[PDB]
Design a protein around this ligand. Structure first.
Ligand SMILES: *[C@@H]1O[C@H](CO)[C@@H](O[C@@H]2O[C@H](CO)[C@@H](O[C@@H]3O[C@H](CO[C@H]4O[C@H](CO)[C@@H](O)[C@H](O)[C@@H]4O)[C@@H](O)[C@H](O[C@H]4O[C@H](CO)[C@@H](O)[C@H](O)[C@@H]4O)[C@@H]3O)[C@H](O)[C@H]2NC(C)=O)[C@H](O)[C@H]1NC(C)=O
Ligand SMILES: *[C@@H]1O[C@H](CO)[C@@H](O[C@@H]2O[C@H](CO)[C@@H](O[C@@H]3O[C@H](CO[C@H]4O[C@H](CO)[C@@H](O)[C@H](O)[C@@H]4O)[C@@H](O)[C@H](O[C@H]4O[C@H](CO)[C@@H](O)[C@H](O)[C@@H]4O)[C@@H]3O)[C@H](O)[C@H]2NC(C)=O)[C@H](O)[C@H]1NC(C)=O
Ligand SMILES: *[C@@H]1O[C@H](CO)[C@@H](O[C@@H]2O[C@H](CO)[C@@H](O[C@@H]3O[C@H](CO[C@H]4O[C@H](CO)[C@@H](O)[C@H](O)[C@@H]4O)[C@@H](O)[C@H](O[C@H]4O[C@H](CO)[C@@H](O)[C@H](O)[C@@H]4O)[C@@H]3O)[C@H](O)[C@H]2NC(C)=O)[C@H](O)[C@H]1NC(C)=O
Ligand SMILES: CC(=O)N[C@@H]1[C@@H](O)[C@H](O[C@@H]2O[C@H](CO[C@]3(C(=O)O)C[C@H](O)[C@@H](NC(C)=O)[C@H]([C@H](O)[C@H](O)CO)O3)[C@H](O)[C@H](O)[C@H]2O)[C@@H](CO)O[C@H]1O
Ligand SMILES: CC(=O)N[C@@H]1[C@@H](O)[C@H](O[C@@H]2O[C@H](CO[C@]3(C(=O)O)C[C@H](O)[C@@H](NC(C)=O)[C@H]([C@H](O)[C@H](O)CO)O3)[C@H](O)[C@H](O)[C@H]2O)[C@@H](CO)O[C@H]1O
Ligand SMILES: CC(=O)N[C@@H]1[C@@H](O)[C@H](O[C@@H]2O[C@H](CO[C@]3(C(=O)O)C[C@H](O)[C@@H](NC(C)=O)[C@H]([C@H](O)[C@H](O)CO)O3)[C@H](O)[C@H](O)[C@H]2O)[C@@H](CO)O[C@H]1O
Ligand SMILES: *[C@@H]1O[C@H](CO)[C@@H](O[C@@H]2O[C@H](CO)[C@@H](O[C@@H]3O[C@H](CO)[C@@H](O)[C@H](O)[C@@H]3O)[C@H](O)[C@H]2NC(C)=O)[C@H](O)[C@H]1NC(C)=O
Ligand SMILES: *[C@@H]1O[C@H](CO)[C@@H](O[C@@H]2O[C@H](CO)[C@@H](O[C@@H]3O[C@H](CO)[C@@H](O)[C@H](O)[C@@H]3O)[C@H](O)[C@H]2NC(C)=O)[C@H](O)[C@H]1NC(C)=O
Ligand SMILES: *[C@@H]1O[C@H](CO)[C@@H](O[C@@H]2O[C@H](CO)[C@@H](O[C@@H]3O[C@H](CO)[C@@H](O)[C@H](O)[C@@H]3O)[C@H](O)[C@H]2NC(C)=O)[C@H](O)[C@H]1NC(C)=O
Ligand SMILES: *[C@@H]1O[C@H](CO)[C@@H](O[C@@H]2O[C@H](CO)[C@@H](O[C@@H]3O[C@H](CO)[C@@H](O)[C@H](O)[C@@H]3O)[C@H](O)[C@H]2NC(C)=O)[C@H](O)[C@H]1NC(C)=O
Ligand SMILES: *[C@@H]1O[C@H](CO)[C@@H](O[C@@H]2O[C@H](CO)[C@@H](O[C@@H]3O[C@H](CO)[C@@H](O)[C@H](O)[C@@H]3O)[C@H](O)[C@H]2NC(C)=O)[C@H](O)[C@H]1NC(C)=O
Ligand SMILES: *[C@@H]1O[C@H](CO)[C@@H](O[C@@H]2O[C@H](CO)[C@@H](O[C@@H]3O[C@H](CO)[C@@H](O)[C@H](O)[C@@H]3O)[C@H](O)[C@H]2NC(C)=O)[C@H](O)[C@H]1NC(C)=O
Ligand SMILES: *[C@@H]1O[C@H](CO)[C@@H](O)[C@H](O)[C@H]1NC(C)=O
Lengths: 317, 173, 317, 173, 173, 317
């Protein structure tokens, strides 16, 4: 009689279809998903330092818009900018806005140090009804609106040496009045001109008198500029009118900081990978949640599923 | 499939084998049985776990990058930002597609390989005492009780013990 | 005696050489080419909407150069710009030309809507011998050259609200006269200044009096600018001279439109993939015709041939 | 080549086999013949068609992109536009090169595999009635007429019918 | 490893084989010996040299590119320059990683293949005159002196010369 | 008795660990390194034409700073800029510095041809103590500082046709004086304005009077601009003061030239691949020395080693 001895392998009733080089659909005993396609819907507040902008864009927090005083000197790994954010101060623009936003985002700090600029012969601390604090007229906290003193505005020729071991970021501006009579009422001379320089750079800006559409009842504008001052260099501001002066400098750091646009709520939880949709698990190598990411994240791909076989071909009975 | 055992000369798998991936079924004069083969099972699992160790829990940290959505029309610079990102995503999407196709082809082949290797190791062990029926089964030409079957499964089967009996049965008329 | 039974495989007298991981030349029974290396030499007019620029650059069609009146309000998937195209109007430049060209190309439409700007107190519709229609003096169709009325040019302070559901693209310019006496002859005051603003943006441009090399007998220049106005926003133009005024706005759309430089003839045929060399078949995954493509196209690679084996190793008798 | 049949133990291919990719040639006491094997032929073709289905007729639509030729010298921005494009083209050129090398290696191997599998399936079917001559041919040790040869080719050959005859011929002196 | 000879049924390699990569050890009534097999050795070497020819001495010339280090903070344009370069490096780093993993897997498999092919070619040559002991060794059932061993190694062994002797020894009782 | 015949394979006592698809550590008999991780520390002077900037940036060699006269008309494949390089002439800036540096680097030549500009009615060849040659006052060699002649500066309206078969690169500048009295002392009128044009382009620059921090005892600045003039086009310079005039043009070529920042010494040796760290061998496909490369170089990767197996699995006795 003898015996029979058969060699064989397992199978499962419920196999999984995968793709191969020679076949787009072959059933294997088991597989695992390589594309993360879901989020929790919230941004976990750990382990990255999250700063929710709430009503404030980064730039409004920088300049010191009245809704943003709580942000002074704060740091972040990720600044979260909300779609509802709006400005509630003097109407302004920033030539190169995207670059200023980027460089502050990447620096990751609003640390500010006041400095004693000698604004000899002018009136300081100008304010406006377009920028209220507690119903008083106010202005951007980090800027100083200079105007005539007893109908004179003597030329400004002011120096600030950088004797620190770090770089300084100065934010300053030019006021563009609505009319010639407004120019004279504020600065006591028919035009201004502003030249801000260091040993290695210079910027001059000309005010441009004219009407723009009223925003918070203001038809004038302020245009914002910036200057970085290296250790051993010197900031020189020279102007005859229309200067929106710096009150000091911001620290500029380097590191892992960034900014993200999202309306996702912040939650008390821990997740390494952040997207605008919310935090996502980072076990898988790929994800199709969002091209925009921060942290240790799977790589964005177009596919919504990629199944890696983790077993043999399934050959059911 | 490239070796031809799984989905090939082995007609189908065994849904009732739940303690291993490969193994043995027998019939002899004491009954029938099934037993997993640990070596081959672990060889396949170890290789697949090797793939998983390279792919799972291995992400890249990135921080400040470029903007990827835009509220205003700008022209040249934005065209370039968008094209860089689209380029990157298409290259990564290609890498992911090829990775899974290649890896899956190879997983199917390596698991087939492990089945084939177990078959070959058993074939050689049986020497002149059995014949390959062509479907992964050997006809054993001698009495082979439960201990005898276990000696084959555990690599202690001594073909010389049974050879006279087997040759007589094989080359009968 | 018995029998012999041999197992074997086919071969062909004419095999094809392919590359592998271990050998740069191995002969197989058959292969297929993966790199598209030829074109038809013509651009098929189907299935993409093709607009042949003929003598007109896109920007000249936009501004309304006299050779381009047939283009008014036309749309395209692909605007084809010819190397022979030249301007035949007042000499102009466009700071950021590439961006304006790009954004109009991508929008895919020249749809224009006239608007009734109140240019109170000035002469409208200025023309020039450098921009003829039918031997008459003329000008860009979409622009309005304003000049003094009875030796006065009262300040312009003009508003146009966007009460539409879509964005508006405004094209406007500044005239740079050749001389101080030309400045006065045209505008009745020694300089001009133009500020064009919305609630969220502003541009001011200063005319610059001086000689440039004569082009169509003109040594002055016009510089072209643009402004996008969102729904609920307002265009404000404020100027005292030198304004080359908008006549209305262009629609700005989003979609699949683009522009391509090519001298390939347009043919009556159907092909999904366009290159500057002409349309190409798109069966193959790769192509080496041109890096510049539009439509469903193979991917550009450096190789001029890549043979995929479609049969076994060829082992001839 | 990795299995060793095609361009290996099979000395060469058959230019006169035009109705299949793999098959059988025989000699017996009624003459000689050739016949294609459909199963193995279709197995190879199906796999190659699988590759073609992933590569042919599968293009990506792109519309407005960046400029890639320039009539004027500009510096930094143009340097970046050119470098992005050169980067992209080199990565795609690498992908295309590797794709074809890998796919071709695999096609040669899988076709060799299908030849080998046909050989193995025939070897097992013949049981103790034939011997492998080492060149893809079996010496069959019994009278095997045209119907007998067709029974091998179609999987109905009953080795037990011929076994006594074959053993006598094989183990003669 | 996918064929199962190297690090499989061949227990270990031979540190004392220095004139080839594969070969033969024997024992017979005149002593013991080792000899390299040139064909199999050269087959493996040629394939590996094929890989090296594609990878060594094949660099790409590049000249003026983009800047990749920056002394000043700038924002948008520099962010884009840095991201393009970081993107490129990560894609090339991935290509290099996968290339070496894939190529190494394949080298291990193709070298195993060449060992297996040599084994199979010897098995077939010996016909009914030897049995596979399961560890890469054949028991040869006839007197096989030095010239006889060399006839096997050089492909001139005539199995018919020894077949009567071998069958008598194999199928004894 | 019979015989035994064993098939087998070699092994080595000293194998090498490599990575595979299924195992991060498997020992093979031999392997080869695919990542170049070391340099010689020096830049080989062959086979690329190397130009060591020594004390000179490319831009200072271009303008003709007094430390850079040895560079006149020289060509390069690779210009090597040293971290110690510093300027020793009149303090200047270049808006778009990076682009001018890049386009000259890529052109690969400082070939300069003098041209006879008719600067009718002004004093030429102005010099400064901030830009000495051999203790004399001097200036940039390629620029011509124009000033009043007998307290007049008649308007300049000067033409230079390009009747060559190649493009011309013109470098010119504007002087920004420290004060109004300096403006008058130099140019005899209260402001200047400079318009430099061709048939297809125009640039106007306004001098900006004011203090910047003293550099080599100078608080004024020069700002540098450039203009490319095509065959058949014409350079037109029109100015009333503050022009820092061109003396002629640079040839602009195209080819394989570039620039690299490095402090590596130049050696007498031959190597195709240059990095800032020094030349590197280029046998291997990859390298981890530096992302910055010039010539036939391995591709930069993050890994510091990648071992390619060149033998079978090693299975020692
Ligand atoms: C089909 O094939 C897949 C892949 O091989 C199998 O999935 C694995 O299953 C095992 C067993 O359940 C998992 O092992 C467990 O992992 C847990 C952590 O996993 C999370 O995090 C990783 C990333 O780090 C993700 O990939 C994963 O999806 C999870 O989000 C551990 O916490 C578990 O620990 C348990 O056992 C240990 C034993 O020491 C104890 O210490 C613990 O107390 C605890 O009880 C465990 O190690 C493995 O994660 C799975 N991998 C993947 C990729 O999913 C399927 O099981 C298989 N299916 C079938 C039917 O066979
Ligand atoms: C070497 O290997 C290659 C690849 O396998 C073979 O090439 C294939 O050959 C077949 C048979 O001729 C082709 O099938 C035919 O395809 C036509 C359409 O092809 C065009 O478009 C595709 C992209 O969509 C391109 O890849 C291709 O190059 C062509 O431009 C069909 O129109 C044909 O239809 C015919 O038969 C059907 C049967 O139902 C009828 O409906 C029709 O009326 C008509 O008569 C047909 O299906 C296939 O396209 C080829 N592939 C490729 C990639 O080229 C070679 O044949 C082979 N050579 C040898 C000697 O074996
Ligand atoms: C482990 O595996 C590797 C890879 O197969 C082997 O390395 C090869 O070894 C051979 C023999 O030594 C080398 O061949 C020699 O190459 C020299 C040039 O090599 C340089 O340049 C290349 C790039 O072009 C680099 O890859 C390489 O690293 C070197 O920098 C030749 O000059 C040699 O010529 C000699 O022999 C010829 C014979 O005709 C004569 O003409 C000459 O006079 C001279 O004597 C020679 O051809 C080969 O370069 C190596 N390749 C690599 C990639 O390194 C190891 O040998 C192997 N190790 C073991 C223990 O087996
Ligand atoms: C200097 C001054 O007082 N000028 C008077 C004009 O401001 C005024 O025009 C009206 O201004 C209204 C709002 O006024 C403020 C403001 O923004 O709140 C008052 C501020 O104190 C003043 N700030 C400073 C530092 O002087 C500020 C400033 O003048 C403007 O914002 C500059 O554009 O104005 C509101 O905008 C009205 O719509 C506008 O008519 C006129 C007429 O009353 O008289 C000027 O003397
Ligand atoms: C306002 C005016 O008529 N000014 C006279 C100058 O134009 C004129 O200079 C000559 O101008 C010649 C061409 O003249 C036009 C033109 O471009 O065709 C005539 C146009 O009507 C006029 N357009 C408008 C809206 O006024 C236009 C314009 O003045 C200039 O283009 C602005 O630069 O000029 C041609 O260019 C001659 O070469 C040039 O001398 C002088 C001398 O006749 O008298 C001015 O009154
Ligand atoms: C035109 C002139 O001579 N102006 C006198 C001022 O230069 C002078 O201010 C002092 O200038 C000092 C250095 O002087 C030079 C220089 O750079 O070496 C002398 C040069 O000849 C002159 N170049 C030309 C082409 O005229 C040059 C030029 O005026 C300035 O560089 C422009 O900014 O100046 C040094 O900077 C002193 O610190 C500064 O006070 C004053 C006072 O002596 O008198 C002016 O007449
Ligand atoms: C130049 O043109 C602009 C735009 O048309 C004119 O601005 C407009 O000025 C009027 C008159 O002050 C503004 O009206 C005000 O509206 C507010 C808000 O309801 C109200 O509180 C005031 O009592 C007043 O009615 C109007 O808002 C403003 N429009 C825009 C779009 O800014 C400007 O007056 C013109 N200048 C001259 C000198 O004509
Ligand atoms: C840069 O800073 C300097 C230094 O303060 C400024 O120069 C000074 O400007 C003032 C005002 O324009 C000048 O005073 C005036 O002089 C005229 C003529 O005598 C007189 O009519 C006025 O009543 C007034 O007194 C002063 O002379 C001048 N000083 C020097 C050394 O030149 C300059 O204005 C600043 N530049 C900018 C752009 O702000
Ligand atoms: C400032 O310099 C420019 C450039 O040298 C001078 O422009 C030139 O002016 C002359 C005189 O009008 C132009 O000549 C004209 O040529 C046309 C075409 O053949 C002809 O029809 C006229 O009868 C006349 O001969 C010349 O084309 C023009 N050159 C360029 C390059 O634009 C300009 O006159 C100078 N201004 C002063 C005030 O000196
Ligand atoms: C922005 O639009 C406003 C509103 O029209 C312009 O302001 C107005 O400008 C005109 C002309 O410059 C001024 O009239 C002039 O007044 C002077 C002084 O009395 C007189 O000598 C002239 O004969 C003429 O009458 C007008 O006063 C002024 N209006 C206001 C409310 O300031 C302004 O010019 C426009 N800006 C630009 C850049 O176009
Ligand atoms: C406007 O502000 C600037 C910056 O504070 C003033 O520049 C400074 O001017 C003084 C006086 O000339 C310079 O002093 C000189 O230093 C050199 C070098 O040791 C020395 O050789 C001279 O004898 C003199 O002491 C000082 O260097 C300079 N500072 C900077 C940072 O440039 C400028 O004077 C002010 N203008 C007015 C009109 O007040
Ligand atoms: C562009 O080049 C032209 C041609 O030289 C310059 O135009 C000329 O400028 C001068 C000086 O501004 C003018 O002469 C002056 O005339 C006034 C008024 O009669 C007088 O008070 C002065 O004493 C002097 O004589 C000349 O008339 C004028 N020529 C023409 C044809 O307009 C122009 O200045 C140059 N532009 C620039 C930006 O440099
Ligand atoms: C197989 O071949 C034999 C011999 O010609 C024939 O009788 C039989 O019908 C065939 N069977 C099948 C299933 O084709």
């Amino acid at each position: 009689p003898g015996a029979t001895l058969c060699l064989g392998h397992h199978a499962v009733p419920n196999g999984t279809i995968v793709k191969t080089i020679t076949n787009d659909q072959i059933e294997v005993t088991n597989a695992t998903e390589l594309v993360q396609s879901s989020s929790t819907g919230g941004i976990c507040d750990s382990p990255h330092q999250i700063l929710d902008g709430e009503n404030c864009t980064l730039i409004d927090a920088l300049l010191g818009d009245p809704q943003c005083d709580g942000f002074q000197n704060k740091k972040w790994d990720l600044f979260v900018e909300r779609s509802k954010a709006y400005s509630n101060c003097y109407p302004y623009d920033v030539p190169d806005y995207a670059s200023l936003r980027s460089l502050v985002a990447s620096s990751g700090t609003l640390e500010f140090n006041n400095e004693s600029f000698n604004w000899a012969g002018v009136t300081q601390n100008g304010t406006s009804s377009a920028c209220k604090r507690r119903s008083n007229k106010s202005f951007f906290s980090r800027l100083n609106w200079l105007t005539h003193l007893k109908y004179k505005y003597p030329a400004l020729n002011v120096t600030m040496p950088n004797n620190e071991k770090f770089d300084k970021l100065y934010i300053w501006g030019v006021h563009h009045p609505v009319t010639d009579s407004d120019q004279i009422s504020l600065y006591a001379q028919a035009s201004g001109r502003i030249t801000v320089s260091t040993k290695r750079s210079q910027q001059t800006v000309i005010p441009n008198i004219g009407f723009r559409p009223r925003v918070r009842d203001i038809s004038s504008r302020i245009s914002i500029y910036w200057t970085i001052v290296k250790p051993g260099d010197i900031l020189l501001i020279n102007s005859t009118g229309n200067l929106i002066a710096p009150r000091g400098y911001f620290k500029i750091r380097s590191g892992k900081s960034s900014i993200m646009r999202s309306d996702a709520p912040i939650g008390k939880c821990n997740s390494e990978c952040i997207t605008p949709n919310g935090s996502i698990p980072n076990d898988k190598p790929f994800q199709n949640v969002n091209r925009i990411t921060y942290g240790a994240c799977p790589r964005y791909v177009k596919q919504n599923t990629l199944k890696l076989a983790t077993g043999m071909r399934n050959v059911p009975e | 499939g490239i070796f031809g055992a799984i989905a090939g000369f082995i007609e189908n798998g065994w849904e009732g084998m739940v303690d291993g991936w490969y193994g043995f079924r027998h019939q002899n004069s004491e009954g029938t049985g099934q037993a997993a083969d640990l070596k081959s099972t672990q060889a396949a699992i170890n290789q697949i776990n090797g793939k998983l160790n390279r792919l799972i829990g291995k992400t890249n940290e990135k921080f400040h990058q470029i903007e990827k959505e835009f509220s205003e029309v700008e022209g040249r610079i934005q065209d370039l930002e968008k094209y860089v990102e689209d380029t990157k995503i298409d290259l990564w999407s290609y890498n992911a597609e090829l990775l899974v196709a290649l890896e899956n082809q190879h997983t199917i082949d390596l698991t087939d390989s492990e089945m084939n290797k177990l078959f070959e190791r058993t074939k050689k062990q049986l020497r002149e005492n059995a014949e390959d029926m062509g479907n992964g089964c050997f006809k054993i030409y001698h009495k082979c009780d439960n201990a005898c079957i276990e000696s084959i499964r555990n690599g202690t089967y001594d073909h010389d013990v049974y050879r006279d009996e087997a040759l007589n049965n094989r080359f009968q008329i």
